[PDB]
Design a protein around this nucleic acid. Structure first.
Ligand SMILES: CCNC(=O)CCNC(=O)[C@H](O)C(C)(C)COP(=O)(O)OP(=O)(O)OC[C@H]1O[C@@H](n2cnc3c(N)ncnc32)[C@H](O)[C@@H]1OP(=O)(O)O
Ligand SMILES: C[C@H]1O[C@@H](n2cnc3c(N)ncnc32)[C@H](O)[C@@H]1O
Ligand code: MET
Lengths: 353, 626
RNA sequence: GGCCCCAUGGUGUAAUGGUUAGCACUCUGGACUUUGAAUCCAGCGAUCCGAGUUCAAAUCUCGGUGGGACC
């Protein structure tokens, strides 16, 4: 609500605002992924990014006239993960010159390879639309889609493969119906996939499908016994680490944290030596005003404090680092002030000794 | 993450087959093996070491009586109990060993380039001498014939908006898919003078064609689960293994641990699991064979062993067991046959819980990765720290002493024993390096090991499994093809009267027992050693053995405990006061002192107080075992 | 003053002596981290009241309620 003159003035003023903004995310493409643009975005408080992968095969890119290489995507992933942002990929099933088995294999590869192991996932099925070259290609009767049952089976198989840490955000496009030459009838697909996977008796483990909010609103199940869980893997050379509180018996989840060791090669010198970055932290549920304490529910019981102290202990001992840095939203900084965290550049930081 | 361990082997020499072996097949149900010789067929059961039937197409007339042709292919058939056979002259014949019903079933006006059999035994497919392919039904009725070198990428096409190696044989190669629906040919291109590959469907429609790639090899092997087809290629400085898809495009590869232009390579073999893969190398002016493994898109050379190229000891051929994925057969020109087996394991370590560090070791290449878990947790690949070695290691083991289970032993390929002690060594030998824990400024305060000894042997695998009962006493097992039995060994420590990194350990004694000792284990707290015989018999051997102390394991009533099956592993436990035994099989079957208790178990563990299990029904549970 | 006629979802309506009143407008929810409103899917609504009869009643009877035209 304060008129400003530059970016920095607005930043300083929004620091003390009460709306309490917590971040922004932007789309991009790997061409604009050099450290210059990353430093630029550091000045904006952005947190997550969109790229658009569309494949796992280089040939397809030139086939699709994408105009770049999958390699550049891979180094963009590595560099961004080293910096400390989050990333969401776009997957593009049923493409020209792609068999169904090709789709299955590439989707399996998307998680089997330590090269990618991404965090955010979005899927968009092919949709032939007038105006594009593909419109004439299909019109020439040379690009054919699948039957709806095939798409249902494809999605059902895919959902069985998602690693637990990955979270799906959306399925299918939102294009108006009377425009697509191959648009499926169903505006709803996740439900059809759920029916199919009930038929096959195999379950999915997506984050969105195991948080308290969705699980309660769709099945009315109350957590009873919540405990901790720890896991780790390797991605883009990183020693990633994932922490959570959740109730396993109903497989319902409440709180999560993503923390890793920084790579040996880095762009931000502030991370040089004895530094471990915590990419993100979050507890799901519903909005609770910062002054309000307990409308029953699970958003202010001190849960985050335990995760912070345990992550700090792990970084001090297992990582063997010497200083902890973290990205944060513009308002959220004050939160870390309560724990004795001080600012440095755009990064909140605490000494470890 | 695991590492393979050799379980048991079976060697058989001195086969009196006329002439020399040419090829062979296996009799699955019968348990015997076929033989392709220069004169006729021979069948023998290994454990019998007795030939069953003999024939001679030389005696009949088809096979050159002087001896000039060879058996292109022999393939066992079970429906009719009669084995088909192919002739270098281009003659397909069928016979049964039961009554010698040999009779020509067909021929071509050329030689049989190669004989291929459908994986389901449904169909056959052969190559002629005039560069064409002949497809026929189950009973040799010619389905069709087509010329090999047509001009198209294949029916499966794309929609859109320098020469062969000198050591190449030019022999075409073909393979099936794992589903019996696609097959790939790898004829050398006569036009470009290079190698080319095409793939066809079950219908015999030209599906796809390979792509121009330099340095292509003659080898080829389809992954049994499909979607992957192996090949070899040499690059200006390195020999590598590449993969192909059913689309016939290059995808993925991994290099070799050898130098540029050193050795010749043969084709590639898949286990039944479609998991393990085996590679055959020829010493180019000491052949070898290696077992690779992929994990998390990382390739681990989990095993390897070599051989001499001296004629009789020069190897003839080999084959994966099409039933057990971890069983191998092999035969060499000295008219000798040999069998091998492995099984999985994890190689953990247990000592005094206060002092133990829950260290875990994994083997790859000529190096060992170690991760200590009492303080750290790292997701494979990477590790806490690694130890290097000159040439590839085979298997390792930790010390079995309590409050000391933090020092291990290493067995290199050339009978070398490496000792690494994690004592408070002031200076660290360069062999020790730190993995993810290290970095620019990152620092930890753990205890690292150091090189201690590099011992040798004091009188191809002369010894079997290796165990380290105590700091100075190691144990191993041998075999005997005649009169099947095993021998224990007593390699004590020879004192250091030389370069203090050396010293040859000699056999104090050679304890010999009859039968195959498939497994063995011991307990440090009890200081007792018990083995499992191939029969499932359980025999405690007094490791002290003032005079060859042997005693079959006794039940609560003081009577033998004969396990109903061969266990994949063994274990000792302290249930109440009982020193009962623990074991299981690959069939999820669990038994305790010859009492079956469950059939859903997929894994288990115990650290001195509690037994933990992994049900196939997706569950775990603990028990206070005291 | 009687004769007749009517009383079903919030409204517009089918149905009828027996295991379930079916539609229609309307409203509500999910797909949806682009949508209260769109597309689909899913869901919540009921026989005027009291007496009778009938094994059994919304449909047969009477009474009441309220409403609708008759001299
Ligand atoms: C980094 C950008 N992303 C986000 O912020 C995601 C949204 N964040 C959130 O919803 C919450 O901050 C959390 C996910 C951390 C859940 O909150 P959590 O349960 O861990 O807080 P705790 O219970 O441990 O501590 C409570 C304190 O946090 C304070 N707090 C809550 N929100 C904020 C905030 N934006 N900024 C500063 N302090 C806050 C509360 O005022 C409370 O203080 P109190 O003593 O007066 O009650
Ligand atoms: C937002 C993501 O969806 C893709 N995308 C954008 N428009 C279409 C369309 N009509 N059909 C398919 N994919 C599309 C982008 O290329 C990106 O990957
Ligand atoms: C909206 S399309 C996806 C983001 C961006 N236009 C890209 O293709 O890289």
């Amino acid at each position: 609500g304060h008129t400003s003159n530059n970016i920095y003035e607005a930043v300083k003023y929004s620091e003390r605002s009460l709306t309490k903004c917590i971040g922004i995310t932007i789309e991009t493409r790997p061409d604009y992924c050099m450290k210059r643009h990353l430093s630029d975005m550091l000045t904006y408080g952005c947190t997550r990014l969109e790229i658009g992968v569309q494949s796992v095969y280089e040939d397809v890119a030139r086939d699709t006239n994408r105009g770049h290489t999958v390699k550049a995507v891979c180094e963009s992933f590595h560099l961004a993960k080293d910096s400390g942002f989050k990333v969401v990929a776009h997957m593009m099933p049923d493409l020209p010159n792609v068999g169904l088995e090709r789709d299955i294999e590439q989707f399996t590869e998307f998680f089997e390879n330590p090269a990618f192991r991404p965090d955010g996932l979005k899927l968009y099925p092919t949709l032939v639309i007038r105006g594009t070259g593909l419109y004439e290609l299909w019109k020439s009767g040379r690009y054919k889609s699948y039957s709806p049952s095939d798409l249902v089976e494809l999605v059902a198989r895919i959902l069985a493969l998602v690693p637990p840490w990955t979270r799906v955000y959306r399925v299918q496009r939102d294009i108006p119906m009377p425009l697509v030459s191959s648009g499926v009838e169903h505006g709803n697909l996740r439900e059809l996939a759920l029916a199919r996977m009930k038929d096959l008796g195999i379950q999915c483990r997506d984050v969105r499908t195991r948080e308290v909010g969705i699980q309660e609103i769709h099945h009315k199940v109350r957590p009873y016994q919540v405990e901790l869980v720890r896991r780790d893997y390797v991605a883009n050379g990183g020693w990633e680490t994932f922490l959570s509180y959740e109730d396993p018996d109903q497989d319902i989840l409440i709180g999560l944290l993503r923390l890793r060791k920084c790579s040996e090669e880095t762009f931000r010198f502030e991370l040089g030596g004895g530094v471990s970055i915590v990419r993100e932290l979050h507890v799901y549920g519903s909005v609770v005003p910062v002054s309000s304490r307990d409308p029953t529910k699970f958003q202010h019981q001190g849960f985050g404090m335990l995760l912070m102290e345990e992550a700090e202990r792990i970084a001090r001992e297992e990582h063997g680092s010497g200083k902890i840095a973290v990205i944060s939203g513009v308002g959220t900084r004050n939160y870390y002030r309560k724990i004795g965290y001080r600012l440095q550049g755009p990064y909140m930081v605490k000494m470890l000794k | 993450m695991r590492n393979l361990k050799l379980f048991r082997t079976l060697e058989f020499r001195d086969i009196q087959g006329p002439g020399n072996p040419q090829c062979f097949s296996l009799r699955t149900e019968q348990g015997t093996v076929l033989i392709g010789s220069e004169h006729g067929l021979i069948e023998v059961d290994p454990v019998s070491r007795e030939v069953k039937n003999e024939v001679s197409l030389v005696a009949e007339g088809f096979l050159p009586e002087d001896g000039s042709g060879r058996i292109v292919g022999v393939q066992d058939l079970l429906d009719q109990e009669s084995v088909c056979v192919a002739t270098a002259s281009g003659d397909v014949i069928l016979c049964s060993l039961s009554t010698q019903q040999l009779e020509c079933v067909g021929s071509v006006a050329s030689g049989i380039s190669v004989m291929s059999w459908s994986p389901d035994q449904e169909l056959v497919l052969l190559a002629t001498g005039q560069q064409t392919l002949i497809m026929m039904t189950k009973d040799f009725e010619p389905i069709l014939e087509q010329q090999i070198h047509q001009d198209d990428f294949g029916e499966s096409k794309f929609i859109t908006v320098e020469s062969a190696l000198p050591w190449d044989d030019h022999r075409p190669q073909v393979t099936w898919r794992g589903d019996g629906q696609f097959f790939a040919v790898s004829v050398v291109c006569p036009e470009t003078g290079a190698r080319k590959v095409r793939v066809w469907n079950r219908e015999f429609a030209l599906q796809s064609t390979s792509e121009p790639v330099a340095g292509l090899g003659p080898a080829l092997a389809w992954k049994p689960s499909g979607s992957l087809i192996a090949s070899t290629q040499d690059k200006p400085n390195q020999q590598d293994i590449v993969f192909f898809e059913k689309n016939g495009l290059l995808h993925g590869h991994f290099t070799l641990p050898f130098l540029k232009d050193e050795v010749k390579v043969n084709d590639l073999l898949w286990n039944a699991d479609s998991s393990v893969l085996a590679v055959w190398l020829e010493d180019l002016q000491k052949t070898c064979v290696q077992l690779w493994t992929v994990g998390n898109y990382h390739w681990y050379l989990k095993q390897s062993l070599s051989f001499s190229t001296c004629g009789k000891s020069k190897i003839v051929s080999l084959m994966w067991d099409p039933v057990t994925p971890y069983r191998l057969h092999v035969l060499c020109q000295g008219w000798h046959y040999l069998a091998y087996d492995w099984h999985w394991t994890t190689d953990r370590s247990v000592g005094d819980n206060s002092s133990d560090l829950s260290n875990v070791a994994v083997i790859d290449g000529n190096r060992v990765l170690v991760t200590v878990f009492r303080q750290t947790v790292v997701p494979p690949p990477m590790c806490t720290y690694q130890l290097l070695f000159p040439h590839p290691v085979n298997q390792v083991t930790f010390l079995a002493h309590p409050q000391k289970s933090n020092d291990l032993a290493v067995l290199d390929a050339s009978n070398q024993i490496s000792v690494y002690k994690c004592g408070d060594c002031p200076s660290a030998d360069p062999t020790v390096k730190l993995g993810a824990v290290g970095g620019s400024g990152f620092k930890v305060c753990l205890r690292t090991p150091h090189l201690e000894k590099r011992y040798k042997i004091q009188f191809p695998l002369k010894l079997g499994l290796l165990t380290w009962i105590e700091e100075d006493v190691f144990l191993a097992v041998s075999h005997s093809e005649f009169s099947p039995r095993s021998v224990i060994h007593h390699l004590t420590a020879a004192s250091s009267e030389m370069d203090e990194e050396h010293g040859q350990l000699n056999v104090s004694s050679s304890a010999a027992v009859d039968g195959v000792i498939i497994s063995l284990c011991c307990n440090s707290k009890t200081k007792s050693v018990v083995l499992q015989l191939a029969d499932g018999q359980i025999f405690k051997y007094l490791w002290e053995s003032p005079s060859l102390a042997i005693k079959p394991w006794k039940n609560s009533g003081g009577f033998p405990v004969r396990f109903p099956y061969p266990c994949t592993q063994t274990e000792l436990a302290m249930i109440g006061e009982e020193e009962c035994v623990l074991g299981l099989t690959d069939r999820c079957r669990f038994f305790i002192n010859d009492i079956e208790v469950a059939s859903n178990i997929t894994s288990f563990a115990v650290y001195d107080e509690f037994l933990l299990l992994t049900t196939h029904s997706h569950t775990c549970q603990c028990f206070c075992l005291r």
